Structures are given as C-alpha cells and as structure tokens.
Amino acid sequence: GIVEQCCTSICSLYQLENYCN
Amino acid sequence: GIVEQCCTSICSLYQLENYCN
Amino acid sequence: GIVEQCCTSICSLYQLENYCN
Amino acid sequence: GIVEQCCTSICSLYQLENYCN
Amino acid sequence: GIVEQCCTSICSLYQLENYCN
Amino acid sequence: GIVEQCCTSICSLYQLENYCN
Amino acid sequence: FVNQHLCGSHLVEALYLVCGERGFFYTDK
Amino acid sequence: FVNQHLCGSHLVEALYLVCGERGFFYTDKT
Amino acid sequence: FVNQHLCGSHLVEALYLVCGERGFFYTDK
Amino acid sequence: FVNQHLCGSHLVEALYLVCGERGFFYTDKT
Amino acid sequence: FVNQHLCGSHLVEALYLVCGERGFFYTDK
Amino acid sequence: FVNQHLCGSHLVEALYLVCGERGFFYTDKT
Numbered sequence: 001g002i003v004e005q006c007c008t009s010i011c012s013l014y015q016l017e018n019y020c021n
Numbered sequence: 022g023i024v025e026q027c028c029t030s031i032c033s034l035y036q037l038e039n040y041c042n
Numbered sequence: 043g044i045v046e047q048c049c050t051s052i053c054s055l056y057q058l059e060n061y062c063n
Numbered sequence: 064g065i066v067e068q069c070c071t072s073i074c075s076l077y078q079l080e081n082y083c084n
Numbered sequence: 085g086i087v088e089q090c091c092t093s094i095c096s097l098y099q100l101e102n103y104c105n
Numbered sequence: 106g107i108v109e110q111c112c113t114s115i116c117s118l119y120q121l122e123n124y125c126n
Numbered sequence: 127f128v129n130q131h132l133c134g135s136h137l138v139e140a141l142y143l144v145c146g147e148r149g150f151f152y153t154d155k
Numbered sequence: 156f157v158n159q160h161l162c163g164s165h166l167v168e169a170l171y172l173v174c175g176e177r178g179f180f181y182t183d184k185t
Numbered sequence: 186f187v188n189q190h191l192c193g194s195h196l197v198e199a200l201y202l203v204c205g206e207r208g209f210f211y212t213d214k
Numbered sequence: 215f216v217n218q219h220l221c222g223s224h225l226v227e228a229l230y231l232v233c234g235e236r237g238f239f240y241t242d243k244t
Numbered sequence: 245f246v247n248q249h250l251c252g253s254h255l256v257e258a259l260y261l262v263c264g265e266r267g268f269f270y271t272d273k
Numbered sequence: 274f275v276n277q278h279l280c281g282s283h284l285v286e287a288l289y290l291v292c293g294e295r296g297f298f299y300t301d302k303t
C-alpha cells in the first residue's frame with residue numbers, strides 16, 4: 001500500500017504516481 | 022461535485038464525509 | 043489537555059470536540 | 064477581526080501575535 | 085514570476101520544478 | 106544548516122530568520 | 127483555475143481526517 | 156475520522172475543521 | 186464563505202507557530 | 215522530488231500535487 | 245494581497261516536495 | 274513563537290510566514 005510503501009519507507013514520484021487514477 | 026459544493030459554500034465535516042470511500 | 047490527550051495519545055472527534063467553544 | 068484584518072490585507076507575524084492568548 | 089504564473093493559472097509539478105535551485 | 110539547526114534541534118524566530126533573504 | 131486548485135488542497139486534507147482508514151476517491155473530470 | 160496522533164499544526168487544523176462556526180481554543184501543552 | 190474559510194485555515198496555522206505555548210482563541214461569531 | 219517519508223496529510227497532499235487533473239484514491243493503511 | 249499570500253503558502257509547500265534537497269529560492273520583490 | 278522541531282514542509286511554511294515580503298532560501302539538508 002501507499003502507506004506502507006511511501007510512509008514506512010521512502011517513495012518516489014513514479015511510485016507516488018502508481019496511485020493516481 | 023465536492024468542488025462545486027464545498028469550495029462555493031462552506032462544507033462541514035458531516036458534508037465532507039459524504040465524499041468518503 | 044488536548045495535547046496530552048490527542049497528541050501523545052489518539053483522540054476521537056467527540057474528544058477532539060471537547061475543545062470547541 | 065483577525066479575519067477582516069488578515070484575510071483582506073496581508074498580516075505579518077507581529078500582526079498575528081496580537082491575536083495570541 | 086511563479087506567483088503570476090502559478091497562482092493565475094494552475095501549475096503542474098513539472099512547471100513548479102522550473103523554480104528549483 | 107536550517108535543517109540541522111531547526112529540525113534536529115529547536116530554532117527560534119531570530120534563528121529561523123537567519124534564512125530570509 | 128487556481129482558486130479551485132488551492133481549494134482542492136484544503137478539501138483533500140479535510141477528507142483525510144474525516145474519512146480516515148475508509149479512505150476516499152478524489153477525482154472529478 | 157482518523158485514529159491517529161494529531162500534533163502541532165495538524166491539531167489546530169483538525170480543531171479548525173472539527174469546530175467550524177463555533178470556533179475553538181488551543182492552549183498547547185497544559 | 187469559502188474564501189474566508191480557506192483563509193481561516195491559514196490563519197490558525199499562522200497562529201499556532203506564532204502564539205506557541207501561550208495558545209490562542211479562534212472564534213468570531 | 216523529496217526522498218522522504220510522506221505520511222498522513224503530507225501524503226494526500228503529495229498525491230494531490232503529483233496527480234493533478236487526473237486525481238487519485240487514498241485508502242490509508244491496506 | 246491575501247489571495248497571493250495564501251497562494252504563496254501553497255506554492256512553497258509544492259516546491260519543497262518537488263525541489264527536495266536541491267532546494268529553492270522564494271522571493272519576488 | 275513555538276519552541277519545537279520544525280521539519281519538512283512545516284519549516285518552509287514557517288520560513289514563509291517568518292520572512293514575508295523579503296522571501297527566503299531553503300536548501301534542505303546541507
């Protein structure tokens with residue numbers, strides 16, 4: 001999940017963008 | 022929508038909660 | 043206090059609302 | 064008030080600090 | 085500037101990134 | 106740096122202002 | 127434009143708090 | 156509503172959103 | 186309406202920083 | 215872009231900024 | 245005035261994320 | 274003014290509020 005990917009770890013733009021519609 | 026509804030006139034928490042899930 | 047209740051611990055809406063005027 | 068004063072014209076920190084305590 | 089450019093019309097991340105460094 | 110001064114430690118106004126232009 | 131993009135900024139943060147774990151969908155196009 | 160720690164500005168804002176027209180009082184650490 | 190509710194959002198966060206421990210009262214009705 | 219942990223409202227906002235016109239979906243903890 | 249000071253608030257936070265370590269300069273006077 | 278750690282966006286914003294018309298420069302970790 002975003003949370004577990006980008007919160008508990010560091011997340012890139014591309015990674016942050018996997019969650020756009 | 023939420024934008025038309027909430028930006029134009031002030032939405033409360035209970036009116037925001039309609040846009041949940 | 044709010045701080046000690048809702049910061050150092052987790053705080054509900056009802057709890058968060060004890061501090062409205 | 065702070066809303067009339069600060070939203071209408073840009074308030075600094077020193078002008079915000081009047082609304083403290 | 086960024087204010088004239090971004091406040092007036094919606095700037096994306098790629099348009100914000102011009103104002104970096 | 107700001108980060109190391111005001112993030113990893115606590116930073117005053119005067120200290121926070123060393124970084125204005 | 128901006129006045130509804132600056133407003134969306136506030137909306138989504140208003141909906142993170144309210145919705146919480148339930149989550150929300152933020153689109154409209 | 157979130158089941159989370161709300162500190163600092165995230166509090167004041169949550170107060171702000173949660174209280175509305177009523178308004179509020181923040182004292183910080185008491 | 187919104188333009189002074191979106192503005193209040195910024196105000197109160199501006200006052201948390203400034204006021205700090207002293208705290209503040211945010212009403213006006 | 216920052217190489218940082220983004221949690222809570224800092225996420226939703228980063229999503230918001232990163233997605234734009236497209237929009238997004240936030241589920242929180244999955 | 246306010247509508248471009250409330251907007252600057254959003255801009256700089258938009259630029260912290262984007263710019264990251266590189267940093268940014270936020271002036272215009 | 275708060276006696277707190279100010280990190281990330283809470284910094285840039287505090288800079289923003291604290292500097293005003295002058296403006297500022299943020300470098301992050303130096």
Ligand SMILES: Cc1cccc(O)c1
Pocket residue numbers: 026027028030031032033133136137140172187190191
């Ligand atoms: C909480 C909030 C922010 C912005 C607009 C609204 O209608 C409601």
Ligand SMILES: Cc1cccc(O)c1
Pocket residue numbers: 068069070072073074075192195196199246249250290
């Ligand atoms: C810091 C700040 C935010 C919004 C309006 C103001 O007048 C001042």
Ligand SMILES: Cc1cccc(O)c1
Pocket residue numbers: 089090091093094095096128131132231251254255258
């Ligand atoms: C992200 C963002 C916020 C405010 C105005 C803009 O043009 C862009």
Ligand SMILES: Cc1cccc(O)c1
Pocket residue numbers: 022024152153154155234235236237238
């Ligand atoms: C109202 C609106 C427009 C464009 C994108 C969105 O996520 C929402």
Ligand SMILES: Cc1cccc(O)c1
Pocket residue numbers: 064066175176177178179211212213214
């Ligand atoms: C100016 C104003 C109106 C309504 C509620 C408030 O807290 C402040």
Ligand SMILES: Cc1cccc(O)c1
Pocket residue numbers: 085087270271272273293294295296297
């Ligand atoms: C556009 C503008 C005006 C005043 C101060 C600033 O930092 C930026």
Ligand SMILES: [Cl-]
Pocket residue numbers: 132133191192250251
């Ligand atoms: Cl705004």
Ligand SMILES: [Cl-]
Pocket residue numbers: none
């Ligand atoms: Cl935080």
Ligand SMILES: [Zn+2]
Pocket residue numbers: 165224283
């Ligand atoms: Zn935060």
Ligand SMILES: [Zn+2]
Pocket residue numbers: 132133135136191192194195250251253254
């Ligand atoms: Zn705003």
